[PDB]
Write a protein that binds this ligand. Sequence first.
Ligand SMILES: *[C@@H]1O[C@H](CO)[C@@H](O[C@@H]2O[C@H](CO)[C@@H](O)[C@H](O)[C@H]2NC(C)=O)[C@H](O)[C@H]1NC(C)=O
Ligand SMILES: *[C@@H]1O[C@H](CO)[C@@H](O[C@@H]2O[C@H](CO)[C@@H](O)[C@H](O)[C@H]2NC(C)=O)[C@H](O)[C@H]1NC(C)=O
Ligand SMILES: *[C@@H]1O[C@H](CO)[C@@H](O[C@@H]2O[C@H](CO)[C@@H](O)[C@H](O)[C@H]2NC(C)=O)[C@H](O)[C@H]1NC(C)=O
Ligand SMILES: *[C@@H]1O[C@H](CO)[C@@H](O)[C@H](O)[C@H]1NC(C)=O
Ligand SMILES: *[C@@H]1O[C@H](CO)[C@@H](O)[C@H](O)[C@H]1NC(C)=O
Ligand SMILES: *[C@@H]1O[C@H](CO)[C@@H](O)[C@H](O)[C@H]1NC(C)=O
Ligand SMILES: *[C@@H]1O[C@H](CO)[C@@H](O)[C@H](O)[C@H]1NC(C)=O
Ligand SMILES: *[C@@H]1O[C@H](CO)[C@@H](O)[C@H](O)[C@H]1NC(C)=O
Lengths: 49, 49, 28, 49, 465, 135, 49
Amino acid sequence: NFNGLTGTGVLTESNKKFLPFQQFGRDIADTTDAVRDPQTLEILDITPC
Amino acid sequence: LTPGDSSSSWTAGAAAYYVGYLQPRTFLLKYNENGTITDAVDCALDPLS
Amino acid sequence: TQSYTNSFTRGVYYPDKVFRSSVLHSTQ
Amino acid sequence: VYADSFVIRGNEVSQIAPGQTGNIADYNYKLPDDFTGCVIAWNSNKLDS
Amino acid sequence: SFGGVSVITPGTNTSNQVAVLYQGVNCTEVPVAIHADQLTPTWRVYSTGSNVFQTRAGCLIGAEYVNNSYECDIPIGAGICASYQTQSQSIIAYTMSLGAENSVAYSNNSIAIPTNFTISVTTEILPVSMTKTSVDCTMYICGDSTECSNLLLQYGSFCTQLKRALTGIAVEQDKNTQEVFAQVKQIYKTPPIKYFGGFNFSQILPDPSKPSKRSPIEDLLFNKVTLADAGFIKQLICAQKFNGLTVLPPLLTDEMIAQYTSALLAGTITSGWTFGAGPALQIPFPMQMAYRFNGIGVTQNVLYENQKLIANQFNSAIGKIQDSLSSTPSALGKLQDVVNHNAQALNTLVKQLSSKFGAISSVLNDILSRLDPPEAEVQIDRLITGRLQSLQTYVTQQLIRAAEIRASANLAATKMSECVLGQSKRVDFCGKGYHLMSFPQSAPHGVVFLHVTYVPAQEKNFTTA
Amino acid sequence: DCTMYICGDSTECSNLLLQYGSFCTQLKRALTGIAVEQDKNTQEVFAQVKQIYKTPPIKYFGGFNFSQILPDPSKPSKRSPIEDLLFNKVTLADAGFIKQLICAQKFNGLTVLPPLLTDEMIAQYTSALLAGTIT
Amino acid sequence: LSRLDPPEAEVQIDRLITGRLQSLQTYVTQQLIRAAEIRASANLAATKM
Ligand SMILES: *[C@@H]1O[C@H](CO)[C@@H](O[C@@H]2O[C@H](CO)[C@@H](O)[C@H](O)[C@H]2NC(C)=O)[C@H](O)[C@H]1NC(C)=O
Ligand SMILES: *[C@@H]1O[C@H](CO)[C@@H](O[C@@H]2O[C@H](CO)[C@@H](O)[C@H](O)[C@H]2NC(C)=O)[C@H](O)[C@H]1NC(C)=O
Ligand SMILES: *[C@@H]1O[C@H](CO)[C@@H](O[C@@H]2O[C@H](CO)[C@@H](O)[C@H](O)[C@H]2NC(C)=O)[C@H](O)[C@H]1NC(C)=O
Ligand SMILES: *[C@@H]1O[C@H](CO)[C@@H](O)[C@H](O)[C@H]1NC(C)=O
Ligand SMILES: *[C@@H]1O[C@H](CO)[C@@H](O)[C@H](O)[C@H]1NC(C)=O
Ligand SMILES: *[C@@H]1O[C@H](CO)[C@@H](O)[C@H](O)[C@H]1NC(C)=O
Ligand SMILES: *[C@@H]1O[C@H](CO)[C@@H](O)[C@H](O)[C@H]1NC(C)=O
Ligand SMILES: *[C@@H]1O[C@H](CO)[C@@H](O)[C@H](O)[C@H]1NC(C)=O
């Protein structure tokens, strides 16, 4: 429930280059792939079950 | 650095100044692996474009 | 000193605030 | 989140709708067709008396 | 007045000059000049009066006519073809050349008989199978949502058919290689010592020095052809297919296929064509080649008197074929396009998911979480019917592609049953010219034939009665 | 052309169709797949020979009469007499070559491209394929 | 269009758009099958030739 974005999967650390204005990561499906934790400002990752 | 003359109609004269106008166009942009834009081509310049 | 020159390639700005990588997205 | 608040004729409830034109819906108040949200109204007899 | 616009260009890494063809219109009218807000192509860079040429398919701008006759590279139409040329460089359009003019000396009593010949080797490339695929309705359309599934079951059996059809296609694909390759009951083995009367076969037999045990030509073919997804421990775009799209692995891995090819090679270089009919029989190679000449109306004495030269010619051709296959820009077009078509189809199928289809959004979770159900089933219904329509086209085209591949596989099976396992009399079937032999080789989703043929040479006239 | 057929001269229709994704790149790739293929069939059926042969001057062949299949130079198109019946018997509808009333009614994106091998150089292959098989 | 406002003209057009799209898809689907047998007939001519 990262500010919405209901889903399910696996969360793990990433090595992305999220710029200070960059918030959400996407792949070529218009589906989320990387998200930043609002409460810690950390670059997570989402992996399907 | 503001000297006076009557330059116009495709001349060259120092101003420390630039201006341009925007138009509605379609662009094709590429993203580097870092996530940084590096190249872009507009579709309404040449047939090759 | 009004004068006319060429702009070459300049003015590309991020059209969206979503991360991409190795993509060829196109926008109008 | 934005809240616009004004008092109007109660017979123009229909004119308070995206894409709906009228005496006040063409020059006074313009409703974009992409409005998501809700509108709340109530009788104002004790309000304007 | 309106029409289409087409762009003729050479490789962008070679030059940046272009030409423009306006489809079926006359340069007398609006292509003659362009004004602002008058033509949808806004750029008025072309003078619309420089080197204007008229063609039966529409007048062409940006290339000048030449009255020469060359074999043409980029076909424009109505017999007019364009190509790059040096004046200092530009693009020209001209008239196609049907070939080199020649005439014959027919007369009452003159006949021309050849005095020399040439053993030649040509190649042939054929697809035999494609990449299997199996997909899920439940996760492609209504991925991870109970109510979406309960709405999907309401449309009846629109999903059992899709799975059944895809499984049938996969099974037929697995049968194709079996019927093409399994022509031998017993796996043979190469002779222990490899001497064949001057004929040098080391370029096509397996090489035990390498771990994979594949011939050098096989190695070139495997390295040149590049594959995207082989469906092995999938666990970037290859892994982005976690929306329901799988890839199953072929039944016969590329180690028995090598053994099948080696068995066919050994049987055809130690037994001739007997092992295609009954028990394999031993016969020395020069005698086999003598009989294969005997099969085209040439007495065996020529082979027995010129064996050294024949072997040298065959060795030279074998050596040259590897270099020609190596240095060519693109000769394996068919297999590459077979891979590319499937990859593009899957990419389009995946990308179709990010389409509103008239719905408010393309994210099922958000739409089913943000709205009270009565409208949720309406929106989900629109999304479901759109996605189902997108899915049906995929199997519809898959069936046709599978049918075409089946026709090609049948042709390859016939060619291997006829040319390889015996000399073939069908002209222009087993190689240009009179046919001598064939050799098979594997390639990722396909086969390659080396046809060894016999072509006449310098001739002399005589008077006949 | 998708836009011409469906959304005839309508910006609002053109904008709305963009929602349906790529239901038109496929409809253009599929038809250009057919168009390329057709120009390849007429190459395999006819262009078997790399060269072009010329019929000998005197049309005597030991008593056989080949006048009805060898081309007659008198006609402007240099076609053999038999195929003249072929063109008269066959009643072609339209070739789409500058159609400019039913043929003009297809001014709805239904263009008809012309073949690469015009039906004049097709005869030369037919002449070559036949002039070399009689001498 | 001249008889409708933007609100439901979108829907009425949307009824026509899917009407012709499904109609056009039938054309190409039949062309491919027709063009399949010709290739099965051209390949018979080349062999016979
Ligand atoms: C000998 O053979 C040559 C070539 O095979 C014949 O010469 C050709 O004759 C035709 C007759 O029209 C000419 O068009 C060619 O240009 C000739 N070719 C060459 C290379 O000369 C010749 O007719 C044959 N017979 C004799 C008696 O020479
Ligand atoms: C038939 O063609 C072959 C083609 O090679 C000729 O072989 C050449 O013969 C010359 C003369 O002896 C040698 O110098 C060459 O090295 C040979 N070529 C090769 C590849 O070995 C042969 O001479 C021709 N025969 C006739 C009668 O013309
Ligand atoms: C013809 O056969 C001989 C042996 O019977 C091959 O000889 C060696 O083959 C290796 C394979 O790459 C080469 O690296 C050596 O240079 C060859 N030695 C000599 C002395 O030639 C020979 O390669 C075979 N011919 C071909 C074309 O492969
Ligand atoms: C891109 O990332 C690589 C590895 O993370 C790094 O070496 C390189 O400097 C980066 N380039 C940038 C940030 O422009
Ligand atoms: C185009 O040709 C040049 C050779 O000058 C080569 O370096 C380049 O890689 C070529 N382009 C592509 C896409 O391979
Ligand atoms: C095309 O232009 C030529 C130029 O003279 C003209 O004669 C011809 O009639 C035009 N074609 C049509 C269909 O009008
Ligand atoms: C090219 O050939 C044509 C024949 O159609 C001739 O008329 C012309 O003079 C030649 N030379 C040119 C076009 O420079
Ligand atoms: C063959 O001989 C006959 C008898 O003289 C002659 O009429 C005929 O023209 C000859 N053939 C050719 C092709 O000239």
